[PDB]
Write a protein that binds this ligand. Structure first.
Ligand code: FHM
Length: 238
């Protein structure tokens, strides 16, 4: 039942709308990453709200958890796409936004991209199954909370516990759980690096001709600084 649901709600293809028939430029690449982010956010929200037990969460905590975990969720899914679609040879942000090393360099996000490429390879090295991927991705949504607590922390704690239980079941073991939790933990530092880069870019957006969509700008200026300032922190296993 649980896996039936995760499979059923898994987002379909999302395109960036990038113009690949034009020479690469920092401005165009980042405007496309931003637009792609705005597009993926719409899908992540619909996905999250259809997850088993998500409605157990207080209304206010629902959108907050989604926004805090957004980058991590996107990174994990992109890593999986890169692995399944191009065997980690390139970063598959979208069918029309695939990054080779030149674009990784041009985007000024090289270090972050190489780490995501490594993440992509780990899906292969660790032989992560599509089902482990689905359960791990859902667990990522419940892996970052505010120090001052959510409106109802208890409902969040129960939900997170239940998703870990589902991972236990899919695994069924100790060695596998160790591998998967280590992989999950590795997503956080990458998201942090992207958060920092994105935050800095928004602040100087008017100087580099980069366009930020409405929702992205709000999340970056309101929620991301809470993470960067330590008010909102990831829940690591290790
Ligand atoms: C620079 C930026 O546009 C910022 O996007 C944000 C994404 C989430 C967030 F909370 C704040 C900003 C970006 O990183 N976009 C982006 C677009 C797509 C994907 N993707 O499809 O996985 C990613 C990725 F997660 F890889 F890094 C990143």
């Amino acid at each position: 039942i649980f896996l039936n649901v995760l499979e059923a709600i898994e987002p379909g293809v999302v395109c960036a709308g990038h113009d690949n028939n034009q020479p690469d430029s920092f401005a165009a690449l980042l405007s496309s990453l931003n637009e792609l982010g705005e597009r993926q956010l719409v899908h992540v929200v619909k996905w999250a709200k259809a997850l088993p037990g998500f409605r157990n969460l207080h209304v206010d905590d629902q959108m907050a958890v989604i926004q805090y975990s957004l980058m991590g969720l996107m990174v994990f899914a992109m890593g999986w796409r890169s692995f399944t679609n191009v065997n980690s040879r390139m970063l598959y942000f979208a069918p029309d936004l695939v990054f080779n090393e030149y674009r990784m360099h041009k985007s000024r996000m090289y270090s972050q991209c190489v780490r995501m490429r490594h993440l992509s390879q780990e899906f292969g090295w660790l032989q992560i199954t599509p089902q482990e991927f689905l359960c791990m991705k859902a667990l990522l949504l419940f892996s970052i909370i505010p120090v001052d607590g959510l409106k109802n922390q208890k409902f969040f704690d129960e939900l997170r516990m239940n998703y870990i239980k589902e991972l236990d079941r899919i695994i069924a073991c100790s060695r596998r759980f160790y591998q998967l939790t280590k992989l999950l933990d590795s997503v956080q530092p990458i998201a942090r690096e992207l958060h920092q880069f994105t935050f800095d870019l928004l602040i100087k957006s008017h100087m580099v001709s980069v366009d930020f969509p409405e929702m992205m700008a709000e999340i970056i200026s309101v929620q991301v600084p809470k993470i960067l300032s330590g008010k909102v922190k990831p829940i690591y296993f290790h």
